[PDB]
Amino acid sequence: QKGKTFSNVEIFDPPTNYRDPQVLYARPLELSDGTLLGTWENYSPEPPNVWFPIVKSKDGGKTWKEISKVKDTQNNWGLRYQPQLYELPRAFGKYPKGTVLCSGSSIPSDLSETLIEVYASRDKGYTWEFVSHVALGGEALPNPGLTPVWEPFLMTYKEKLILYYSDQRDNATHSQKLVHQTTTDLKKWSKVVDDTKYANYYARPGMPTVAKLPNNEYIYVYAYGGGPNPPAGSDYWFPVYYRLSKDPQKFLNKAHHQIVSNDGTTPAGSPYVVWTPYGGKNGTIVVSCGTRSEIFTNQALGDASAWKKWDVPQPTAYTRSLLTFQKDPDLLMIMGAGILPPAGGKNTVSASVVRLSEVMK
Numbered sequence: 001q002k003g004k005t006f007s008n009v010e011i012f013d014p015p016t017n018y019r020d021p022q023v024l025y026a027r028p029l030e031l032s033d034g035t036l037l038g039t040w041e042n043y044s045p046e047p048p049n050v051w052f053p054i055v056k057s058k059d060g061g062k063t064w065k066e067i068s069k070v071k072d073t074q075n076n077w078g079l080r081y082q083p084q085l086y087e088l089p090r091a092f093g094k095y096p097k098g099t100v101l102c103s104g105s106s107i108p109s110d111l112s113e114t115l116i117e118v119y120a121s122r123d124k125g126y127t128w129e130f131v132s133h134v135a136l137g138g139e140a141l142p143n144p145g146l147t148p149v150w151e152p153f154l155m156t157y158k159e160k161l162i163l164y165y166s167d168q169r170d171n172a173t174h175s176q177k178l179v180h181q182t183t184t185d186l187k188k189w190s191k192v193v194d195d196t197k198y199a200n201y202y203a204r205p206g207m208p209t210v211a212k213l214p215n216n217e218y219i220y221v222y223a224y225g226g227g228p229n230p231p232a233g234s235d236y237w238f239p240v241y242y243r244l245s246k247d248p249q250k251f252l253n254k255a256h257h258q259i260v261s262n263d264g265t266t267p268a269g270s271p272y273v274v275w276t277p278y279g280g281k282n283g284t285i286v287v288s289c290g291t292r293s294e295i296f297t298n299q300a301l302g303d304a305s306a307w308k309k310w311d312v313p314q315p316t317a318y319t320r321s322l323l324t325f326q327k328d329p330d331l332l333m334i335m336g337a338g339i340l341p342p343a344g345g346k347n348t349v350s351a352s353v354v355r356l357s358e359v360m361k
């Protein structure tokens with residue numbers, strides 16, 4: 001149990017010539033053999049077309065090396081935004097258990113279109129193959145009236161793989177809404193199913209992440225753009241809300257809850273949720289958001305009155321992400337790739353591993 005924590009390891013410091021914000025949107029993955037993989041949006045000068053770098057750690061995140069790049073082999077655009085890594089926990093069609101997936105959005109350098117893709121690695125991240133196209137959208141700017149798709153998140157439920165994402169395609173009715181599609185083979189995707197939408201046109205629920213709880217329930221966490229009560233001097237904000245459901249295909253008609261910590265802190269922006277068995281029968285739900293450095297925890301299965309907040313040494317970052325370690329539930333990785341543009345040339349990809357038993361004190 002000794003020597004497993006470490007603070008602010010620098011995974012990747014981009015060159016001066018990368019385009020603002022240079023890097024962003026870090027995502028980690030623990031494989032069944034204990035190795036870690038990571039990726040981020042890599043804003044290299046183009047051409048050549050942008051790619052998702054894949055880094056590997058064998059020592060629990062202390063040291064890293066690049067072992068491959070996921071490249072767009074289909075569109076001659078690049079893999080540009082919102083990567084997401086995922087290890088299959090069971091076979092889906094011809095992809096066995098242990099296959100690594102990388103989802104993300106392929107987008108031309110002019111940002112005229114958006115395309116959520118799935119790539120797969122059969123060798124724990126050394127090589128990649130295109131698998132399928134998921135969702136095509138329009139222009140890659142987060143403005144009302146445009147029709148892009150964004151921000152894929154993968155999770156298995158029973159025999160289905162669910163891919164949740166953000167959707168502006170219903171542009172006459174919702175500025176953006178949250179949706180999913182499912183697959184049983186990674187080839188054929190189900191029709192679009194709504195997960196969260198709001199009647200007010202200018203509402204923009206976005207950036208969905210999901211975690212399984214030990215009471216047969218799932219928690220769906222998102223940033224509710226256009227949510228009520230923007231703070232003084234703000235006409236529009238992105239408070240973190242969530243929903244609870246037994247069936248993670250049916251969040252749509254579940255009551256929303258805002259996350260507010262015991263002291264009144266209101267996380268906002270680009271959230272990320274995990275659950276670990278640490279801390280009791282209920283374990284611990286841990287959420288990060290994009291505007292605070294603290295983590296927010298809940299040891300009461302998502303009871304709205306039970307959120308707490310704790311400092312960690314990893315700085316605030318856009319869609320700062322979290323990872324739990326299968327063989328040690330007390331250990332939490334927090335990974336970030338800096339802030340939204342303008343970043344001032346100072347974003348780097350970094351991570352910390354903390355113990356909840358130390359940090360929750």
Ligand SMILES: OC[C@@H]1O[C@@H](OC[C@@H]2NC[C@H](O)[C@H]2O)[C@H](O)[C@H]1O
Pocket residue numbers: 024025041081082140141142150151166176205206207340341
């Ligand atoms: O990831 C790069 C980033 O994506 C764009 O924003 C997407 C919006 N984020 C919250 C909403 O869910 C979505 O519409 C932004 O232009 C890029 O910097």
Ligand SMILES: [Ca+2]
Pocket residue numbers: 013014015016345
């Ligand atoms: Ca740099």
